[PDB]
Design a protein around this ligand. Structure first.
Ligand SMILES: CCCCCCCCCCC1=C(C)C(=O)C(OC)=C(OC)C1=O
Ligand code: SF4
Ligand code: SF4
Ligand code: SF4
Ligand code: SF4
Ligand code: FES
Ligand SMILES: [Ca+2]
Lengths: 589, 905, 145
């Protein structure tokens, strides 16, 4: 039985516990291709269900995702409660290694849900995002304001009636009045945040760290309330890097959305490509062969080494040593030589396809892979012994912005931070995707404290394990097809397209109108370069995505930022920013 | 009936087969040879499903869902493994000989064969041998032929012969060398041959007019509109690309024009893409021709209109309801004149009085196919209202349909129906000045002058009911034919009487009304159908006004020093010399038109109006249905200096500048509400379409498909900065793909049909409640008037017998589907299809004059000694000259007129 | 359907020949000796049946020439793997009820009978490997396993 089959998920013990707790007429179970039990629950019992899941013997301790969905345009809703809007809550229990997805149905006029922030503190930014893009109000939320759009924005962009393109609206006319109005909108108002901008002894200092700061890894701004050098409170202001990629997912075909998936986490590349194409293959019912899995593992581990090299060099640069970034980018250029050879592009390859990859491996890729595998470990050991074993770097890093497993779980922290708290939870081992079971590699974990130094050394060990994976896949690569034999493989193989009429017809209708994926819900969760990246795709049975929800780890890390750096100095914040491994396309999407 | 599809219980209609029942429920079964209009023949063998007779049955039997009735207690499986493999094998067998032609095929992206190859999931080729090839034929200027792409599904021949009644298309050849076409090269002379490009699931028959300037279906910007080439008002989907009208697709209206258009309405759209059209307001200063924008044109026009003592307005039946009303409200009630002549207006008002006061229900075009005995009086339907002639052919085959239904044979078994009803058919009696194209199925054809046709109609009315006025002087053989017609009409259950204003006589319409009244008096379900001339003739008749002669004499006597002509050439309804003298004598001629007419030399100001592809409006068709047509594209998006607006917008802003000295661009709903407020008889045009505030769950209706391409590059030669998409404040549509085009949306105006997996015109299946039936959530357009409680009285003005006077020749009209329309003949593709101007003569009259066939004779009408070559017409009665109406220099107003000095020159 | 020597001691009734996987037909039997190659005989039969099609319905019209060309390849020794399986699938998908009339089931009965009884003659005509494509320089082909 294939793993993409629509599973009703009535064999999960969490469903039985929910039946024995709330009764058999309290919820509906939706059969999806997510691999996760989807439970439609009533709005009145949402907090009780959340408390019951939090108080389980092996509880669901993490809020993975929280977002809305416009169901007004969804034609195929058989077996679902009647809804104009819906809110889904994706929760993870690491102890059971299980997920659940609670869905709440809302009418068009009664668009209010009880807040989830008391059960999970990381729900704050998710609820602000759901209010900003869908207009759904959360009762009891502390500060429900726009988080992706500026405060002087009319309408909610992820609603179906909102226009997706900039050409629908008037072209961007920057006048003096508009500049003044948007500058007053962008000015930080501490009375809105309850910052209390003064003390009897002295005055607090309000500083904009970002958008134009060397320490900020993008266009975002942390507003710091300071006394002298110490941070009293922080307001991380995001939404400056919003590209509307989910609304773009509603606007492109299944095949033509792959380059947009590539730019979600621009240091990730094929790592960003994999969850989307895996979810689309779950929707289509495509089981890719072994060679496709090994090639995709190759490219994603190569890009993981690339991203980790950039992260380590960036951390060393923000600590103060400006030398190893040059050599780390030289190693990045070696990886880029291999990636240019394979995919034809440097940093956004867009090489993964539905059912396979764009081309076969060119003749001679193993020579460049062997060159990189010989070049890498001496350079990495040099970086370690030159900067990562530096006592000044250790003084700037060890003990700085430290949190335990409780803070990592309550804020949805994934990736190197969660493993640095001692929780051994990696997606490539817990829920193995793309044939990662065939590769012998270790998962580094920490001692229980998630320092800057601990996260950086964990990423160094992850780089070494990725080098081991690359060596294993270089020594054993299958000799088969680079595309699946499914009819929904988009696009079909090129030579058959160029000389057969069936293949020409399939190519013609798949690159123009798009592949028709039948109406189902799919979900794929992978271990990204910066944490856990997930794609949740709702298909309406058409050639375009009805809903594309992208869960990213940098969003959770930036929401965790005020709770881990409050009371510290600004230097600790600089090291914390350099040691988080975030980019801002990842956050704002 | 109750069926079980894949274990799911469904309630279907037991008189339908399994294919249309399952397609109505939304179940996707592949099919080629079945069409909702043609029937089931079981040719392509693509619709296979596995049938079980019991709920507990494992083996089953592969049957054809198109040939299997949807009886109660049938358990069918569509996605069973055996059925799916057989359907994939049928697609594979069709793919063995199919050419590698999809990039160079006009049907690519609109192909049913592509959609069904993808739907069955066949994408691997194991056939390694050669593919058969075919030569191609020249089918004329409209249809391009590519025989290699054929799958031998027999849809073309079934439509063209068993539906359209054509005679030059057929199947030839053998085992796998089947050819579909003509026995030689030549033009397909059926008036409905253009539907072959949508009937054919492959790219064999393609639109050559669209193939000249070809774009794909996703690149097309569509709109729902009404065809403006005659009075039937078929719903069309005009689609444009790069600022020019590319294609006219069929728009499904289950009430009017369900699957089929006529060739004039499908290939006569080329006048929109003419380069001589006015694109700006142009003002004449002596010999100089200066160009204004909208504001200066309004200010100058209002200044000269205020500096005049009386302003009159000449409308047109070519204009919409709103533009004619805006002219009427600009110039006043008493100063508004309809652009048609006095006789044309008299015939039009008589036809309207018969329709909305005669007490006889006027059927819709779909309902014409259900009437038993058809009597056509005076109308040449196949050349003026051709789609009505197609529905008349269907009503004629209704006899074979009922005879096969008497033998417990299903409705969809079209081959068995044609086998049982071999040549027996419903009675059809056509009267004309000559032979018609309905004569192959007509029970009788009466070739006579219009006076004698009217006398035969009055004799039929007198023989059906003795209270009708009698006509004395009928020959005994004609009396025998009349009593044959009377016995056929009296024995019918639903008789239909079809007349119109194109016959050129009032007494023909009076005789048709008397026949309908006599049939109603016997207790019969009689229907009557008047065929008007232009698209909005009935709306102009309802709104009313003076004739063109009254406006001409008002200009000639000097009481009118300002004339506003709305979309009229004025040479079609009156003599060119008198019109030219009247417009030259008037000191201000202001012409709102979108086509370069001949009266623009004398025009002091020309307003570049918008055609149907660039304007919104309402048109009233021949049966009194108000239909809204929507704008397809904004003309100023590509060409920035184009100032081309709606004619009602022109005239409303002109009246606002006349009154308050302010330019006011209104909205379509404001003009609509003005019509409903001022004219109570046009009150139904408000409900023809919903207003601009209508939304489908908050979003508008998309004019283009969701895969519309080239957005950031289609205007990059002008400027690299892409402008905002044009905003439609008039309608509920948007000039973008950011909108709704779902098959399950609660609307009646569908711009185009597309569904996931259905890119062909078979995508209209998803937009109907049942396939081949009504559109889902009702058809667009509402009827203006209902059938009255009481009817008219008998018209006692029986005309005298036509006596051929010496010297004077009565002009017999000869209408042509290609040539007799004002705007269709301006299309460049119609030049190769329009017949040469030939004057038709009797052999006896030509022998008296010494003329043989071919040579040229000259006749003078209103000081115009024009010379035409002579064609001998045996069926034409002596004393008449046959002239082609609507040609160059021969107006349709010439019908019924005299002709002096007919000499060989 | 072709029958063997063991079927010769069978009465010539409809139900007796029908039970043994054949048809009585017109009861005018035709004998095939050992010198007659059965692939050539079935090729001649299918050539007659394909060229005497009426062309109304898809499976006979566009699948009998496929069997004809497969048997021409097998006659000349240019058969490729999958051809006999294609013939078997054609026999299964041209049976009673699949086509509009009964010309095609009677067409494909000798083919399936010959494959059932004399498969070794059909397998002997498969000499070259399967090749439907040709090499396009610059595009690496998808090597399905
Ligand atoms: C000039 C000497 C070499 C400099 C190399 C810098 C490499 C990247 C530094 C990290 C960084 C990233 C990724 C980054 O995205 C960013 O935001 C725009 C920064 O602030 C300016 C950064 O500092
Ligand atoms: S008819 Fe259809 S399948 Fe055939 S070449 Fe044209 S687009 Fe392709
Ligand atoms: S030409 Fe077109 S409609 Fe006619 S049989 Fe061939 S595929 Fe069918
Ligand atoms: S019958 Fe008249 S309205 Fe219909 S398509 Fe032809 S010209 Fe147009
Ligand atoms: S099976 Fe019969 S109906 Fe079908 S094409 Fe062959 S001979 Fe004609
Ligand atoms: S659709 Fe039934 S056989 Fe063609
Ligand atoms: Ca408009």
């Amino acid at each position: 039985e294939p793993a993409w089959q629509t599973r009703d998920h009535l064999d999960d013990p969490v469903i039985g516990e929910l039946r024995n707790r709330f009764g058999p007429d309290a919820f509906t179970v939706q059969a999806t291709r997510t691999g996760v039990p989807v439970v439609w629950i009533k709005r009145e019992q949402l907090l009780e269900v959340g408390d019951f899941l939090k108080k389980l013997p092996k509880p669901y301790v993490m809020l993975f995702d929280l977002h809305g969905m416009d169901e007004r345009l969804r034609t195929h809703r058989e077996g679902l409660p009647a809804a104009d809007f819906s809110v889904f809550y994706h929760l993870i229990s690491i102890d059971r290694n299980r997920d659940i997805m609670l869905k709440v149905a809302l009418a068009e006029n009664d668009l209010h849900v009880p807040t989830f922030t008391k059960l999970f503190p990381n729900a704050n930014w998710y609820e602000r995002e759901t209010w900003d893009l869908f207009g759904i109000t959360f009762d009891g939320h502390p500060n429900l304001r726009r988080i992706m759009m500026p405060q002087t924005w009319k309408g909610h962009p992820l609603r179906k009636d909102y226009p997706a393109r900039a050409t629908e609206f008037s072209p961007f006319e920057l006048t003096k009045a508009k500049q003044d109005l948007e500058m007053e909108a962008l000015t930080f108002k501490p009375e809105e945040w309850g910052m209390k901008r003064g003390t009897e002894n002295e005055d607090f200092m309000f500083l904009n760290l970002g958008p134009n700061h060397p320490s900020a890894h993008g266009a975002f701004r942390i507003v710091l309330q300071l006394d002298g050098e110490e941070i009293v409170d922080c307001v991380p202001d995001i939404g400056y890097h919003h590209r509307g990629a989910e609304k773009m997912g509603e606007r492109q075909s299944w095949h033509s959305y792959i380059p947009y998936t590539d730019r979600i986490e621009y240091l990730g590349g094929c790592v960003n490509e994999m969850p989307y194409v895996l979810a689309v293959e779950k929707l289509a019912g495509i089981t890719v062969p072994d060679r496709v899995n090994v090639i995709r593992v190759m490219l994603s581990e190569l890009f993981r080494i690339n991203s980790h090299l950039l992260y380590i060099s960036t951390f060393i640069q923000d600590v103060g040593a400006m030398t190893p970034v040059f050599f780390a980018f030289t190693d990045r250029q070696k990886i880029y030589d291999l990636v240019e050879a394979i995919t034809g592009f440097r940093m956004h390859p867009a090489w993964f396809r539905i059912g396979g990859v764009a081309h076969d491996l060119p003749r001679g890729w193993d020579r460049l892979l062997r060159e990189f595998l010989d070049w890498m470990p001496k350079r990495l050991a040099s970086y370690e012994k030159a900067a990562l074993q530096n006592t000044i770097l250790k003084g700037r890093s060890q003990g700085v912005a430290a949190y335990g497993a409780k803070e990592a779980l309550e804020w949805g922290t994934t990736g190197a931070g969660l493993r640095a708290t001692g929780i051994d939870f990696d997606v490539r081992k817990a829920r193995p995707y793309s044939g990662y079971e065939n590769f012998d590699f270790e998962i580094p974990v920490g001692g229980g404290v998630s320092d800057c130094y601990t996260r950086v050394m964990l990423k160094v060990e992850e780089l070494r394990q990725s080098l081991r994976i690359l060596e294993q896949c270089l020594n054993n690569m299958p000799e088969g097809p680079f595309k699946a034999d499914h009819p929904l493989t988009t696009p079909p193989p090129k030579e058959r397209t160029l000389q057969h009429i069936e293949t020409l017809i399939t190519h013609f209708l798949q690159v123009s109108w798009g592949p028709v994926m039948p109406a189902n819900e799919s979900f794929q969760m992978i271990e990204a370069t910066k944490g856990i990246n997930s794609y949740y795709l709702t298909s309406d049975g058409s050639t375009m995505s009805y809903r594309t929800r992208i869960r990213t780890p940098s969003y959770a890390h930036l929401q965790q930022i005020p709770a881990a750096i409050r009371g510290s100095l600004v230097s600790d914040l600089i090291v914390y920013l350099g040691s988080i491994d975030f980019v801002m396309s990842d956050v704002d999407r | 009936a109750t069926i079980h599809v894949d274990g799911k219980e469904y309630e279907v209609n037991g008189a339908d087969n399994l294919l249309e029942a399952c397609l109505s429920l939304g179940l996707d079964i592949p099919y080629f040879c079945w069409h909702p209009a043609l029937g089931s023949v079981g040719a392509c063998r693509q619709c296979a499903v596995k049938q079980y007779q019991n709920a507990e049955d494992t083996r089953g039997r592969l049957v054809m869902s198109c040939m299997t009735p949807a009886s109660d207690g049938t358990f069918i499986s569509i996605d069973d493994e055996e059925a799916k493999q057989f359907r994939e094998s049928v697609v594979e067998w069709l793919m063995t000989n199919h050419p590698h032609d999809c990039p160079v095929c006009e049907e690519g992206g609109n192909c049913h064969l592509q959609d069904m190859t993808v739907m069955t999931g066949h994408s691997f080729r194991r056939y390694r041998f050669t593919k058969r090839t075919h030569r191609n034929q020249d089918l004329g200027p409209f249809i391009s032929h590519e025989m290699n792409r054929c799958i031998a599904c027999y849809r073309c021949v079934r439509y063209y012969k068993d539906y359209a009644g054509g005679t030059d298309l057929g199947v030839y050849g053998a085992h796998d060398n089947v050819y579909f076409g003509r026995p030689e090269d030549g033009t397909l002379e059926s008036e409905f041959s253009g539907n072959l490009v949508e009937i054919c699931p492959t790219g064999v028959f393609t639109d050559k007019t669209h193939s000249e300037r070809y774009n794909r279906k996703w690149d097309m910007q569509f709109a729902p509109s009404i065809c403006q080439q005659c009075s039937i008002g078929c719903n069309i989907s005009p689609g444009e690309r790069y600022g020019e009208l590319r294609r006219i697709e069929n728009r499904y209206n289950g009430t009017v024009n369900h699957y089929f258009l006529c060739d004039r309405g499908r290939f006569g759209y080329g006048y929109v893409n003419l380069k001589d059209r006015p694109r700006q307001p142009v003002q004449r200063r002596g010999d100089d021709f200066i160009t204004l924008n909208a504001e200066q044109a309004m200010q100058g026009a209002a200044d000269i209109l205020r500096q005049s003592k009386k302003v009159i307005g000449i409308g047109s039946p070519r204009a919409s309801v709103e533009s004619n009303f805006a002219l009427r409200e600009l110039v006043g009630e008493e100063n508004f004149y309809t652009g048609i002549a006095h006789g044309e207006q008299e015939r039009l008002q008589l036809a309207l009085k018969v329709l909305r006061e005669g007490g006889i229900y006027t059927p819709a075009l779909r309902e014409i196919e259900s009437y038993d005995a058809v009597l056509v009086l005076g109308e040449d339907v196949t050349q003026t209202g051709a789609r009505v002639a197609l529905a008349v052919r269907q009503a004629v085959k209704g006899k074979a349909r009922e005879m096969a239904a008497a033998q417990k044979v299903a409705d969809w078994q079209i081959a068995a129906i044609l086998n049982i009803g071999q040549r027996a058919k419903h009675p059809l009696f056509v009267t004309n000045v000559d032979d018609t194209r309905l004569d192959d199925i007509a029970a009788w054809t009466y070739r006579a002058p219009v006076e004698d046709q009217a006398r035969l109609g009055f004799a039929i009315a007198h023989a059906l009911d003795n209270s009708a006025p009698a006509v004395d002087g009928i020959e005994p053989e004609l009396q025998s034919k009349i009593d044959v017609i009377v016995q056929a009409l009296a024995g019918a259950k639903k008789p239909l009487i079809i007349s119109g204003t194109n016959a050129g006589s009032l007494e023909v319409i009076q005789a048709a009304a008397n026949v309908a009244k006599a049939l109603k008096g016997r207790g019969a379900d009689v229907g009557i159908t008047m065929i008007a001339r232009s698209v909005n003739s009935m709306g102009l008749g309802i709104m009313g006004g003076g004739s063109l002669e009254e406006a001409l004499t008002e200009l000639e006597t000097g009481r009118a020093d300002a004339v506003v002509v709305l979309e009229n050439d004025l040479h079609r309804h009156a003599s060119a010399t008198r019109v030219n003298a009247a417009l030259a004598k008037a000191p201000l001629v202001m012409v709102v038109d979108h086509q370069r007419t001949a009266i623009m030399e004398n025009a002091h100001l020309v307003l570049s109006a918008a055609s149907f592809a660039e304007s919104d409006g309402t048109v009233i068709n021949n049966e009194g249905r108000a239909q809204r047509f929507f704008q397809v594209y904004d003309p100023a998006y590509y060409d920035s200096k184009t100032v081309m607006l709606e004619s009602w917008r022109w005239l409303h802003s002109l009246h606002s500048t006349l009154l308050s000295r302010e330019v006011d661009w209104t909205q379509l709903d404001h003009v609509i509400d003005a019509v409903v407020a001022k004219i109570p008889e046009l009150a139904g045009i408000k409900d023809a379409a919903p207003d601009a505030t209508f939304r489908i769950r908050g979003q508008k209706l998309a004019r283009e498909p969701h895969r519309y391409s080239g957005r950031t590059a289609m205007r990059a030669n002008i400027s690299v900065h892409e402008p905002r998409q044009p905003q439609d404040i008039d309608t509920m549509f948007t000039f973008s793909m950011e909108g709704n085009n779902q098959p399950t949306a609660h609307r009646s105006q569908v711009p185009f049909a597309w569904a996931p997996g259905w890119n062909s015109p078979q995508a209209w299946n998803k937009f109907q409640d049942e396939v081949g039936g009504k559109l889902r959530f009702g058809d667009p357009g509402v009827r203006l008037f209902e059938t009255s409680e009481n009817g008219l009285d008998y018209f006692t003005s029986v005309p005298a017998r036509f006596q051929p006077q010496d010297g004077k020749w009565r002009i017999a009209p000869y209408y042509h589907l290609f040539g007799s329309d004002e705007l269709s003949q301006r299309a460049p593709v119609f030049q190769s299809r329009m017949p040469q101007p030939y004057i038709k003569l009797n052999p006896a009259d030509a022998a008296k004059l010494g003329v043989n066939a071919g040579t040229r004779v000259s006749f003078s009408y209103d000081g115009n000694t024009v010379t035409l070559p002579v064609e001998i017409a045996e069926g034409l009665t002596a004393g008449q000259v046959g002239l082609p109406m609507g040609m160059s220099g021969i107006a349709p107003v010439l019908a019924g007129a005299h002709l002096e000095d007919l000499k060989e020159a | 359907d072709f029958l063997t020597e063991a079927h010769l001691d069978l009465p010539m009734e409809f139900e007796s020949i029908g039970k043994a996987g054949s048809r009585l037909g017109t009861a005018l039997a035709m004998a095939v000796d050992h010198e007659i190659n059965m692939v050539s005989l079935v090729r001649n039969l299918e050539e007659f049946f394909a060229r005497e099609s009426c062309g109304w319905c898809t499976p006979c019209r566009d699948g009998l020439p496929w069997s004809v060309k497969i048997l021409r390849a097998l006659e000349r020794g240019e058969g490729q793997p999958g051809d006999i399986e294609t013939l078997e699938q054609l026999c299964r998908f041209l049976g009673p009820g699949k086509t509009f009339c009964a010309h095609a089931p009677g067409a494909v009965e000798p083919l399936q009978s010959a494959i059932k009884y004399f498969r070794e003659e059909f397998e002997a005509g498969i000499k070259q490997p399967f090749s439907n494509t040709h090499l396009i320089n610059g595009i690496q082909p998808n090597l399905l396993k």
